[PDB]
Amino acid sequence: SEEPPFDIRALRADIEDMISEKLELGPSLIRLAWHEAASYDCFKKDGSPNSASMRFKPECLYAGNKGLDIPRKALETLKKKYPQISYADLWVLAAYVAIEYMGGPTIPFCWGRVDAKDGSVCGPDGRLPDGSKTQSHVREVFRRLGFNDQETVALIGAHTCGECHIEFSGYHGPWTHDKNGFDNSFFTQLLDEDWVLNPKVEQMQLMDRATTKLMMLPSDVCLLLDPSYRKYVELYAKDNDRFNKDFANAFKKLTELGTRNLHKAPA
């Protein structure tokens, strides 16, 4: 109900077209917006979330952000065509477009994020979660961000799409049988499969006994091990509509952390 100064309808279509040419970009755009928000610390009120601060060294070089230069570079062409949008809004909008385009919820978008002007606003390394660790670590990070256990589990559900790359994280493979689809299947797979050690990946990960084509990280399976998290894994595995709703709300919350003076965009 407040029109942004950029042509948002044309921009959403251009993002969909870009993804249509390179489907794997869809999940990386989600990972980009999440990691741009994940630098927050809600107690220190620092880390410049949702400000495209990851455009600056040192934050672009943190291990947890490896490979995110690919979606950032793809979005440059659109920034040149739509100069009135900030990078920060562009990264968020592209993630929302990607989510919907892969069959996920249509998340109400607010615009007006202001880009970080220099790298002095960047928070320290160590803010991003580490897939080799488990629930004590995951809960520490998500509590730092300001999320509860319900919201933590819903958000990790984004692993429904995309895959790990050895050159970026040292892990390998998709989590689900359709890495291009956004739904509750991460939770379905986590709950329904027998997760066995993958013998051939040097960084410890699990694979499904049934096909061996799926993967889970230590940080994924901790959602089954921790009784508080497991309740939500079960909730989402049996109720895709609840998953879509809860993911929308939490991801919207995530991409609005540390922001001010935002405006509702037209749907």
Ligand code: HEM
């Ligand atoms: C415990 C918390 C999390 C951990 C430890 C974690 C870890 C990882 C790792 C290791 C990768 C592989 C990166 C690569 O090799 O390309 C990855 C990818 C990905 N992550 Fe997460 N993640 C977490 C939470 C989240 C959240 C909250 C979201 C979004 C809401 C998210 C969205 C994605 C997506 C979409 C990919 C696929 C990227 C691609 O296909 O290029 N993750 N994550």
Ligand SMILES: [Ca+2]
């Ligand atoms: Ca940031």
Ligand SMILES: [K+]
């Ligand atoms: K999927």
